[PDB]
Subunit: 114 residues, 4 copies
Amino acid sequence: PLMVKVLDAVRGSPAINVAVHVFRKAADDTWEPFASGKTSESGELHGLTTEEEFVEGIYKVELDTKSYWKALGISPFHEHAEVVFTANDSGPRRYTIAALLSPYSYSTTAVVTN
Amino acid sequence: PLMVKVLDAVRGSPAINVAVHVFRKAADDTWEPFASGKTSESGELHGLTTEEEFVEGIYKVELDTKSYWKALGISPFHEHAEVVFTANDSGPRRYTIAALLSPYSYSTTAVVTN
Amino acid sequence: PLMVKVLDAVRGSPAINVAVHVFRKAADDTWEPFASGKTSESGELHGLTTEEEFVEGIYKVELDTKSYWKALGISPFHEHAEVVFTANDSGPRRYTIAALLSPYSYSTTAVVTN
Amino acid sequence: PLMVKVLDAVRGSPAINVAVHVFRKAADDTWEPFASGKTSESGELHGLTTEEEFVEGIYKVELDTKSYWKALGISPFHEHAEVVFTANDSGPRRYTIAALLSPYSYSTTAVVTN
Ligand SMILES: [Mg+2]
Ligand SMILES: [Mg+2]
Ligand SMILES: [Mg+2]
Ligand SMILES: [Mg+2]
């Protein structure tokens, strides 16, 4: 139900080997680790969760953008990029969290499909 | 030393009355409230802090984008837009945190000057 | 060698049925029609050209964003979105022209892979 | 009535000395030169035109991003960034054309005020 795709706006390439951590908000409002991985050679991260596990709730997807830019020898602004959203059952649904990275800027878009 | 500017990509206008909360990471690794405010009719938020108060640290600027869109009748994807960065680690700088908002997407850029 | 992918930042969806025109710059500096199509249900447009046809030169990819937003009943700013670039033989290469659309804003990124 | 503002997403700075050419579509459907200039140290370009001269029409604002990046030692993807729009079709407006530049990506937003 949840995929992450990351692009590099400096090199015009997939952003490879980006660490991605997903958290789910707990009843005590803390962030509990939910799933994680690293983006592939295609800048994508699949298989984070399953339909059974990915119930409604508030999720945070954190991309370690600082480590990514450091590895490329480029001084970045952000510590990380965080994407926070509520998962909503309103029919069958797939979430793609897309991110476009520059050293002092990023954009993120949600592509939500049936 | 810290200003926030927000635009609405649907209307082609400043994003007015966006609530902004700034936090600073404390010694115990928790997020301590640092300053807050709301964007003006120009989409800008000035006067959050001072050169004296704005010491080195890791800061989080949280824009309440969900409330912004809902007040305009739109159910957006994100809970908020969070911008996390180390500030002033090589001396005082002036930071403009810019954000561009769409219902299922946002971008953020930092302009940093000496 | 050339693919186009378009996303809709208002609906968080592929941008479907977007008209795409590709032009190649001629010797007299005019834009000559090269290929065209409409994005699919996945927001993608494949099969525009072939390795044999897609030689080095200056190309323009035009997305009819105005007609797209009009069909959705949304007032847009731009007449269209234009992406202009030189194709460069520097090893085996695939170009993806990606675009993210809002009514008063768009971004475009080139993903260039081997 | 027409201002251009450009930021550099690699440096987190204004994009200084970006050449800007404005064209207006003539009655014979060709692009007639309308105004030009370059961005200041603030990344802004003011004084392109006047309320009297800036009549209804279809305008193209072309930013020479390729020359900008090459002067900084970067071989970018795009030849330029072109922004094409109908202006003043329901009376005089003020237009800010904003652009955010990366070597293989750019975004542009319009802020339109009455
Ligand atoms: Mg429900
Ligand atoms: Mg120190
Ligand atoms: Mg060559
Ligand atoms: Mg009229």
